[PDB]
Design a binder for this molecule. Sequence first.
Ligand SMILES: O=C(O)CCC(=O)C(=O)O
Ligand code: NI
Ligand code: NI
Length: 280
Amino acid sequence: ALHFLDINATEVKKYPTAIQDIIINRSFDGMIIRGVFPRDTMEQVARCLEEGNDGGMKSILNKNEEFGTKVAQIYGHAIVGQSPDLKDYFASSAIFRQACRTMFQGSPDFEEQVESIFHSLSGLPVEIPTGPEGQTYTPATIRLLLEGREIAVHVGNDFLLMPAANHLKTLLDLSDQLSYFIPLTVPEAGGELVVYSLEWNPQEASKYAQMQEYMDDVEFKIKSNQSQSVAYAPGPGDMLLFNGGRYYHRVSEVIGNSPRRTIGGFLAFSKQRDKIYYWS
Ligand SMILES: O=C(O)CCC(=O)C(=O)O
Ligand code: NI
Ligand code: NI
């Protein structure tokens, strides 16, 4: 039984240590924050991507056609799965920030609005990380889930076991990371975030020679219903902020001809717990 708060965006200042409460005190596990962006803004950014006047976002669309036709497509390289040099990731991330800033037209700016939310919920400065030579990480990527596609079950803290995380681990507290995302467009059915009470467990994972074999077993656990779940279908402009680092989660298959498009990533404390970093 994971515990999520449902508040409005005008209420964030009433929860000034929410992020500390989720990560450090562990007194609840996530929150939905309604209307972080206006619906008009979501519809505007959506039309930019549909029509192709997207500031170049289309140039960093990764269709993932080598992962099968059941996988999400993504604008921008996600850091998960990147090689530890991060060269291609840093390039896509610069393109992403410019395209994103173009599409949002400051009405409101994506980075500014997301940073304001995280600040209100922590009382701390908020920053996008920079690489060892000053390269910018991306604040977010955009996931595009067409009809019949899903995001398979996974857990966020596995990032801390990947070579892509090497540099980020020098800046981070190494406690749980949170997930955050905001729908731009929502599908007619499906496309639901499901979060399970099954937790990240590197101890169990180390008994497997191939992580794929370990995930095949996680899939059996969650499909046996042994684990409790909660499920959410935020609307356009609502933000979902949750302990995806600790808890396995997935997004259910999209149904119908309207794609699910979501913008988001992750956040976590700095080494000394005196700043919020956020990235994708
Ligand atoms: O639906 C999305 O854009 C991402 C879902 C997810 O896996 C996360 O927020 O960590
Ligand atoms: Ni995730
Ligand atoms: Ni539904």
